């Protein structure tokens, strides 16, 4: 038959990101001499909606240590941070909502957001509205720090990797029913072309594994192997269990 | 509506005139000529199209310079001038 | 009754194609094209329209004398005045508190 929908996504012709109104990429400061020996001060100048994003961004500006001028940065705003607020970034900074410190300088239990997976990568973990990572221990020899991500996973990263104190703003966005098709419309209109969604079970065989039959139905197990092949992976990929999850989840 | 009501909306060109070959096969959005290949340094042609070739090979135009090569060959690529004689 | 026509080839109601009807000396109605309205210069500190300052489309500011583009204070046609009160006060105090900060820790160092 033909190439199915989930294979056409990859050439991203009509599947690229709707990017025009975006404020620019959100990132921590480049890890320089300031941030990595002392601290440097900025001011949050503006906290602002970024199309397609849930959490607002915070525009923060710092003096350039090496040239006379102002260099502006695009943060994700943590709940609580405000215009006019002074933001402190650096190894020798202090534990306040909004500041940005390396995980090695913050006690166990600290709550942080936008943390780096390697030092200097300018931020990777816990950016979505409401998310955060908890520091749960340090190993001072080979300076690592163990953290717990939004997903539940624990992971150890360099104690030099940086994070910003607190939680990302916009929480509870998903507590509210969309109610109508149209709000999803405007939702995905500012993201990418993934909406709405025809069930493969409503297409013909040319179109999809699930396609065809004189009743709608999948007709074989819908849990597909990891080592299945492009054109085969529709359904429950690599699913280690299936069915209604019964009883407390919670990573132990 | 796929027939004549829809033919009424045909008022936009896919191709214009091609600088190199004159033909009106210069595809605007593609910026390349469906006939001669412009602006490919080479000229489109295909051995499965002998007619098209014959439509465009050397000799179908003026041959402004090549015309004269065989006379010039014939007289051993002469230089100078002819002299003079009598009656 | 006297209806009217665009005076330029563009036939669409785009922002650059606004029309105003007007009675000529010939005693008839005729369209006149209209430039977009200028918006007022704003303050770099607070964002309000800054008073004293003319409002022109941007290149039209070169066509116009310097006094239309300033008020005669520090930061004249740039920041908003109550904004410069703030700047001054805060500057003075912070430059003062600096001497205060220094003399304390000059004292800490000798009383330790």
């Amino acid at each position: 038959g033909r190439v199915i929908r989930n294979q056409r996504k990859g050439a991203g012709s009509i599947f690229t990101s709707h990017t025009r109104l975006r404020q620019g990429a959100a990132k921590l400061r480049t890890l320089d001499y300031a941030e990595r020996h002392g601290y440097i001060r900025g001011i949050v100048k503006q906290i602002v909606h970024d199309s397609g994003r849930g959490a607002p961004l915070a525009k923060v500006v710092f003096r350039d240590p090496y040239k006379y001028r102002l260099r502006e940065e695009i943060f994700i705003a943590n709940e609580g941070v405000h215009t006019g607020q002074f933001i402190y970034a650096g190894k020798k900074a202090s534990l306040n909502v909004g500041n940005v410190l390396p995980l090695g300088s913050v006690p166990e239990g600290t709550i942080v957001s936008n943390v780096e997976e390697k030092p200097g990568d300018r931020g990777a973990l816990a950016r979505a509205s409401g998310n955060y990572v908890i520091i749960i221990g340090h190993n001072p020899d080979e300076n690592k720090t163990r953290v717990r991500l939004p997903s539940g996973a624990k992971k150890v990263i360099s104690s030099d990797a940086r994070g910003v104190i607190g939680v990302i703003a916009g929480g509870g966005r998903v507590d509210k029913p969309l109610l109508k098709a149209g709000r999803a419309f405007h939702k995905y209109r500012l993201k990418r072309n993934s909406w709405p969604k025809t069930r493969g079970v409503a297409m013909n065989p040319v179109d999809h594994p699930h396609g065809g039959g004189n009743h709608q139905h999948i007709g074989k197990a819908s849990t597909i192997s990891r080592g299945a092949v492009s054109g085969q992976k529709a359904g429950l990929i690599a699913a280690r269990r299936t069915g209604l999850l019964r009883g407390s989840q919670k990573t132990q | 509506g796929k027939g004549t009501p829809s033919f009424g909306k045909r008022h936009n060109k896919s191709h214009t005139l091609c600088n190199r070959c004159g033909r009106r096969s210069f595809h605007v959005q593609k910026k390349t000529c469906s006939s001669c290949g412009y602006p490919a340094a080479k000229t489109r042609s295909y051995n499965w199209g002998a007619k098209a070739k014959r439509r465009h090979t050397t000799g179908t135009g003026r041959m402004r310079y090549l015309k004269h090569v065989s006379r010039r060959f014939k007289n051993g690529f002469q230089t100078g001038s002819a002299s003079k004689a009598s009656a | 009754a006297q209806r009217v026509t665009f005076r330029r080839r563009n036939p669409y109601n785009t922002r650059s194609n606004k029309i105003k009807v007007v009675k000529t000396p010939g005693g008839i109605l005729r369209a006149q094209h209209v430039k977009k309205l200028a918006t007022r210069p704003k303050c770099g500190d607070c964002g309000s329209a800054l008073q004293g300052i003319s409002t022109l489309r941007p290149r039209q500011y070169a066509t116009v004398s310097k006094t239309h583009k300033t008020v005669s204070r520090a930061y004249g046609g740039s920041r908003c005045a109550n904004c410069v009160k703030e700047r001054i006060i805060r500057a003075f105090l912070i430059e003062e508190q600096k001497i205060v900060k220094k003399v304390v820790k000059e004292q800490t160092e000798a009383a330790k």
Binding site: - | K13, L17, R24 | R9
Partner: protein, 50 residues
């Protein structure tokens, strides 16, 4: 069309000039063989395709 390029207008000019009957003296030339102009175009019978 109606706010044109020089290229199209140049072509239209060549087109207007080629649009006329046989110059009748030609009919009288020794061994003349051309009756009439067989390449006559008309704006409402055949389109130029630019």
């Amino acid at each position: 069309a109606a706010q044109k390029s020089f290229r199209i207008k140049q072509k239209m000019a060549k087109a207007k000039k080629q649009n006329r009957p046989l110059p009748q003296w030609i009919r009288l030339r020794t061994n003349n063989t051309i009756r009439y102009n067989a390449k006559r175009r008309n704006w409402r019978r055949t389109k130029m395709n630019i």
